[PDB]
Amino acid sequence: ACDYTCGSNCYSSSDVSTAQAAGYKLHEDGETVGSNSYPKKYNNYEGFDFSVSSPYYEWPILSSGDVYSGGSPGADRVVFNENNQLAGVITHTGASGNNFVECT
Numbered sequence: 001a002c003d004y005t006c007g008s009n010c011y012s013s014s015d016v017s018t019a020q021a022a023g024y025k026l027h028e029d030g031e032t033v034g035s036n037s038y039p040k041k042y043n044n045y046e047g048f049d050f051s052v053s054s055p056y057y058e059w060p061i062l063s064s065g066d067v068y069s070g071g072s073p074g075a076d077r078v079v080f081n082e083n084n085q086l087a088g089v090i091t092h093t094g095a096s097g098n099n100f101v102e103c104t
């Protein structure tokens with residue numbers, strides 16, 4: 001079964017955990033990856049009611065299970081905070097434009 005389902009993508013908790021550990025580490029070293037500079041601040045334009053405190057950073061989670069390292073980031077993102085608490089998994093899939101919806 002899926003712990004998080006983002007459109008057609010299936011993610012297990014381990015998947016989220018491995019992406020999140022990668023995003024935070026980079027967040028801590030003050031480094032970026034890819035043309036869209038990840039991880040980056042997540043602004044909450046959407047106004048989702050996260051259970052963890054802001055500020056928020058987004059990093060891509062890939063359907064292949066590989067850790068993002070450049071090129072296409074895909075539509076899925078793992079959202080974490082300063083304390084490395086998971087806030088949520090979100091996706092551009094099924095969302096208009098560059099908006100996001102939460103993975104279910």
Ligand SMILES: Nc1nc2c(ncn2[C@@H]2O[C@H](CO)[C@@H](O)[C@H]2OP(=O)(O)O)c(=O)[nH]1
Pocket residue numbers: 036041042043044045046058077098099100
């Ligand atoms: N929609 C949306 N995008 C954000 C937010 N914070 C940063 N972004 C990024 O800014 C762009 C302009 O909205 C979005 O595509 C997204 O980049 P990503 O596509 O690379 O994740 C946010 O709260 N909402």
Ligand SMILES: [Ca+2]
Pocket residue numbers: 010011012015065
């Ligand atoms: Ca997986």
